[PDB]
Every structure is written in C-alpha cells, then in structure tokens.
Design an enzyme around this catalytic site. Structure first.
Site, mmCIF file in Angstrom:
data_model
loop_
_atom_site.group_PDB
_atom_site.id
_atom_site.type_symbol
_atom_site.label_atom_id
_atom_site.label_comp_id
_atom_site.label_asym_id
_atom_site.label_seq_id
_atom_site.Cartn_x
_atom_site.Cartn_y
_atom_site.Cartn_z
ATOM 1 C CE1 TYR A 110 28.534 -2.689 26.077
ATOM 2 C CE2 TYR A 110 31.271 -2.878 25.095
ATOM 3 C CZ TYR A 110 30.117 -2.318 25.633
ATOM 4 O OH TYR A 110 30.450 -0.702 25.598
ATOM 5 N NE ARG A 150 5.470 3.445 32.605
ATOM 6 C CZ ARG A 150 4.266 3.758 34.118
ATOM 7 N NH1 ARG A 150 5.146 2.613 34.726
ATOM 8 N NH2 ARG A 150 3.506 3.743 33.956
ATOM 9 N NE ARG A 190 32.498 4.212 30.469
ATOM 10 C CZ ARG A 190 33.176 4.741 29.812
ATOM 11 N NH1 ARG A 190 33.748 6.141 29.995
ATOM 12 N NH2 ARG A 190 33.866 4.066 29.049
ATOM 13 C CB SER A 191 32.451 8.049 27.805
ATOM 14 O OG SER A 191 33.692 8.332 27.067
ATOM 15 C CG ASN A 201 29.112 3.433 19.678
ATOM 16 O OD1 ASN A 201 30.008 4.388 20.223
ATOM 17 N ND2 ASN A 201 29.616 1.923 19.339
ATOM 18 C CB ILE A 232 35.772 16.502 18.834
ATOM 19 C CG1 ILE A 232 34.745 17.053 18.313
ATOM 20 C CG2 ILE A 232 36.588 16.995 17.951
ATOM 21 C CD1 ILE A 232 34.295 18.064 17.753
#
Ligand SMILES: Cc1nc(=O)c2cc(CN(C)c3ccc(C(=O)N[C@@H](CCC(=O)O)C(=O)O)s3)ccc2[nH]1
Ligand SMILES: Cc1nc(=O)c2cc(CN(C)c3ccc(C(=O)N[C@@H](CCC(=O)O)C(=O)O)s3)ccc2[nH]1
Ligand SMILES: O=c1ccn([C@H]2C[C@H](O)[C@@H](COP(=O)(O)O)O2)c(=O)[nH]1
Ligand SMILES: O=c1ccn([C@H]2C[C@H](O)[C@@H](COP(=O)(O)O)O2)c(=O)[nH]1
Lengths: 286, 279
Positions: A110, A150, A190-191, A201, A232
C-alpha cells in the site's frame, strides 16, 4: 430513511443463507459469496459500525502510515496498532522465502504503491523520493483541476511486485468521483473477511474520502464498497449470529479539528469521533 | 431474465441520475457505483433489446489475447472500434509525434501478457518480458481454484502517460466453486447506451474461454461500474429500448476441444438462437 449499517448486516445474512463451503490456506474453511456491493452515505455521518466495535485508533494510524508511504510493520506497531505484525514477523517472512529480509518489512504494499508505483523496491528503510508515480497526489490534483474526470484512480495491484509482498493487497483499487461538490469513493476489495477486516476497511476508505474532501474543499458523498470473495470463516459464524441480534445505533460524526492544506500534514490529533456508541466487542480471531 | 438487470440499471440512471459534464462536452446523466449479475449457466448474455456487435466482441477479445496493441490489426478484421484512438491526429494530440499510426501504446493486450515490461512500439518483440497475467490466471485456476487472488489488471499507473486511451476495464477477478468459473469486472466508466452491452459480452466470452480451457462450467459474470452514465442525446433512443420486452438469451457453442488460450480462433465459436430487436 434506513440505517446504512443494515447493508453490511444484510450482506452477513446473505452469506449465511446463500453462501457456499470453500476451503482456504489456513484449513479453517469459509462460507463464501462472489460479488457484493453496498453503499454508505457519508453526508453528516461516518460509517463506523456500531453492532460491533471497530478499532478506530488502528484505522486512523494505518491510514496515516499508508500516506507516509511506509511498508514497515514495526513503525505501525510502535503506535499500538498490531494489525500487520503477524505478516511482518521473522516466522511468516521465512515461510515465504524472505530469509534475508529484515523483520517488519512487508514489501511493496500500500504505502509503496500509493506513492511510488512502479519504482524499484529495495527495502523498507530505503529512499524513494521522486521515484515512481505518486498516485495519491495525482488523485488530489485531478479532483482540484478537473473533477468531472472518470479516471481518478488509485491502484495497489502491481503484478510485477506481487512476488515481493508479504500479503498481496485486498484493496486492489479505488476510484473517486465528483458531482455537485460531493466527493465519493468506490473500493474494489478482492477478498473480504466479513467478521474482522471488512468493518475496518469500510472505515479506512470512509476516512480517506473525508481527508481528500477536506483538502479539495468538497463535501463527503457516498462510499461504495464492492467485494470479490465476500466470506465468513467457519469459526466466526457463532459470533456473527450474536451480532445480527443487535439493533444498530446511529452512526457517529467525524470532525476535523483544523484547516490542513496538504494530505502529508494530517496528524492523528486532527480527528475526533463524536457520538460513537457501539455494542460490546466480540472477539473474532485470525 | 438476466437482461432485466441491465434494463433496471438504465431506469435507475434515468430516475436517480445527476447531470454531469465530461471530456466531450456532451453531458450525461450519471450514477456512481452499480453492480449487476448475469448467469452464464446454459445461456450467453448478449443483449436482445438492442443488437450487440458480436463480431467485434469476438475479434477484439482474440486481439487482446494475442497481446496486440495495433489498432490497424483489429481494423483489418472489419472492427473499427479503436481506429480514432490510433489515428495520426489523435496520436499527435497526445504528443506521440514519432509513434506509428495504429499504435495505441501499452493497452489491454500488452498488460494482460507483459505487465510491467518496457514498452517500445506495437511491432516489437516482448517474449518472456513482464508478467503474463492471462496465463497465470489459467494456471492458478487449474492448480489452486480456492485462491482469492486470481486477478488480471490493465490499470498500470506507470504506463498511463504512454496510452492512447486509459482502460475502462481496470481489472477483473475470477472465482471458482463447485466446478463453476465466475468473473467480476471493475469497469471505471461505462456508457450504458453503446459500450456496456459490448463489454458485458467481452468478459462473458472470456469466462467461457477460460472455463473451457480449465474444464469448468461457466458460472456468473458480475459487472461492477464506477461512473455508470447515459449521454443526454441517448436518452430518447434508450427510452424506446426500455419499451421492448426482452427475448431469451442465446447460447454459445464452442465447436472443438482447444488446449491453450492462444489457440482459440473466431471459427471455433457459434452463437445459437440470437433474436435481437431491430436497432
Ligand atoms: C483472515 C484474516 N487474515 C488477515 O490477515 C487479516 C488481516 C487484516 C488486516 N487488517 C486491516 C486488520 C487486522 C486486524 C484487525 C483488527 O481489527 N484487530 C483488532 C481486533 C478487533 C477484533 O477482534 O474485533 C485488534 O488489533 O485488536 S484489522 C484484516 C483481516 C484479516 N482477516
Ligand atoms: C461516448 C463514448 N465514446 C467512446 O469513444 C466509446 C468508445 C467505446 C469503445 N468500444 C468498445 C466500442 C466502440 C464502438 C462500439 C460499437 O459496438 N459500434 C457498433 C454499434 C453502433 C450503434 O449502435 O450506433 C457498430 O459500429 O456497429 S463498441 C465504447 C463506448 C464509447 N462511448
Ligand atoms: O484489509 C484487509 C486485509 C485482509 N483481509 C482478509 C480477507 C481474507 O480473509 C484474508 C486475505 O487473504 P487472501 O484472500 O489473500 O488469501 O484476510 C481483509 O478482509 N481486509
Ligand atoms: O469499452 C469501453 C470503452 C469506453 N467506454 C466509454 C465510457 C465513456 O463514455 C467513454 C470513455 O470516456 P472516459 O471515461 O475515458 O473519459 O467511453 C465504455 O463504456 N466501454
């Protein structure tokens, strides 16, 4: 008008009723659904979930750490935020074949990608001034000069650098959008571990949007959270069912306590959560 | 009918959209953040309420798969969709005076196959250079289907300045469960009138291709949009389209056993029962 948190809770129920059994690295298993989307208004409220306490201090310090361009888990840890320490430990690094890498060095994740995309990554302590693309700054400059654009995108997914990362990014990218002086943000995640990470998040990007809105002179709009593998973990089912019983309380507000001109100048002391009244936290392991 | 989702999205943008200007000065009704789901189980989502340019979908995908960034190559196949962006004027407008006509830069094909390699020109040799994302996707689906990192990304900030057009399809993700291959597309910007139906068909087709290679049944295609918009001069024609009752989706037959993604040719595909309304 209904409470934005009912969307997240809706997503949990959907995964419990319609999810499919699916295995993972850790042998635990998951109930999983592919492709979800939720919308959280940021207009005079901040989407910090109330049905379970979210680790606000960690949200804030992790974002400030991302903004500095840091990839040193020990730096984040020094601030009482342990969320990336397992991934930076001597053990976990050795298990990916990074024997000669220092402890805490997460790789080109990141921070590195947001500020130095495509630069050659050496180690966490190295100098990278002027190297690569500063996506965060480019986003900010574009929102100011050409809001209708955009293409206002930040991407952390770098295939060239993947092999070097301790954990490949979950927030592959985010896009910003501006209309009638309102800044919105969509995140492609993504996950997503719905029990632990996802609420954290949601708060991270909600906060990012507040930060950039402030810098650019705009009002926060929506935060759209889009998921790939929404899941989960099996050992989280019981604690999540308890959470579904709880009626949400109203979202808190986020006050920014001074005028900040550049994103690098934000400090933790500048932010204040007003009226956060969450239910007692349930432990969700990892 | 899965097409009711797309039509639903159109109606939502007409009723809830906001007036918003764009690069081309035309103006749009715009909504930020939409998502639709299209079953690929024994049907192929080629929209019936307005005809979709199938031939262009197929040839454009095969062109991406080859790793081509040469608009003239695609054009030679009767598919002119990238020609304006490859033309000499346009190229000079972006300060690419010394670049050959048709050279779109490091776009889709380049990124899918050679991500992070050093881009010289469209005709250059890039064997073994960069990351072959398409092949890595295919190898991961075969060896470790539960993986949550099966991603192809065309958004490369380092290469942006060199491209004729920055990508709409920033990334796509694959997912495998119970022998069903699914795909999600993050499309940063979508013209609901023209491009979006084409784009839905492109990734639906990709998913059919990879499912076939990997021995899996096609599952869902999830289409996620950033700036979903209708141009103001498309409102009246789109309202006409909303009047029309959708007809069932066609089927996609693949006419032979293909072992590698590079081996697919246009002749291998056949659309069965496509009955679109007149455009
Ligand atoms: C399965 C899983 N593996 C991970 O590595 C993982 C990593 C993150 C990285 N991340 C962004 C976070 C990790 C841990 C957080 C957290 O909130 N920790 C609190 C615990 C609060 C609670 O248990 O509810 C803490 O430090 O005490 S936030 C998030 C979810 C993950 N989920
Ligand atoms: C406003 C806008 N500007 C563009 O430059 C643009 C480019 C694309 C690139 N792309 C992926 C395509 C361009 C043209 C297509 C097409 O299918 N043309 C058909 C249908 C014509 C019609 O319905 O009027 C054709 O030429 O047969 S598909 C898509 C949408 C866009 N929308
Ligand atoms: O910010 C984060 C970081 C990680 N995870 C999760 C999701 C997965 O459960 C796991 C990631 O591992 P993989 O998907 O890469 O296998 O941790 C999140 O939800 N949010
Ligand atoms: O495959 C494509 C390529 C382009 N567009 C659209 C959306 C916009 O109207 C225009 C691109 O404009 P920008 O977002 O690049 O500014 O073409 C699509 O819908 N699909």
């Amino acid at each position: 008008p209904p409470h934005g948190e009912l969307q997240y809770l809706g997503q949990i129920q959907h995964i419990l009723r319609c999810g499919v059994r699916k295995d993972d690295r850790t042998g635990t298993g998951t109930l999983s659904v592919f492709g979800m989307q939720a919308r959280y208004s940021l207009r005079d409220e901040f989407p910090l979930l109330t049905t379970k306490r979210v680790f606000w201090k960690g949200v804030l310090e992790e974002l400030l750490w991302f903004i500095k361009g840091s990839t040193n888990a020990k730096e984040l840890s020094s601030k009482g935020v342990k969320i990336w320490d397992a991934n930076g430990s001597r053990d976990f690094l050795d298990s990916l074949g990074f024997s000669t890498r220092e402890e805490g060095d997460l790789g080109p994740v990141y921070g590195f990608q947001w500020r130095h995309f495509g630069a050659e990554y050496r180690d966490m302590e190295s100098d990278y001034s002027g190297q690569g693309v500063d996506q965060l700054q480019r986003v900010i400059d574009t929102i100011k000069t050409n809001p209708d654009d955009r293409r206002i995108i930040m991407c952390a997914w770098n295939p060239r650098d993947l092999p070097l990362m301790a954990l490949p990014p979950c927030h592959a990218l985010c896009q910003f959008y501006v209309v009638n002086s309102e800044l919105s943000c969509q995140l492609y995640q993504r996950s997503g571990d719905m029990g632990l990470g996802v609420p954290f998040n949601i708060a991270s990007y909600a906060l990012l949007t507040y930060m950039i809105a402030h810098i650019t002179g705009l009002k926060p709009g929506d935060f759209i959270h889009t998921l790939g593998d929404a899941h989960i973990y099996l050992n989280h089912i019981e604690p999540l069912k308890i959470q579904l019983q709880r009626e949400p309380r109203p979202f808190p507000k986020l006050r920014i306590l001074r005028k900040v001109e550049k994103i690098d100048d934000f400090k933790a002391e500048d932010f204040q959560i007003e009226g956060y009244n969450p239910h007692p936290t349930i432990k969700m392991e990892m």
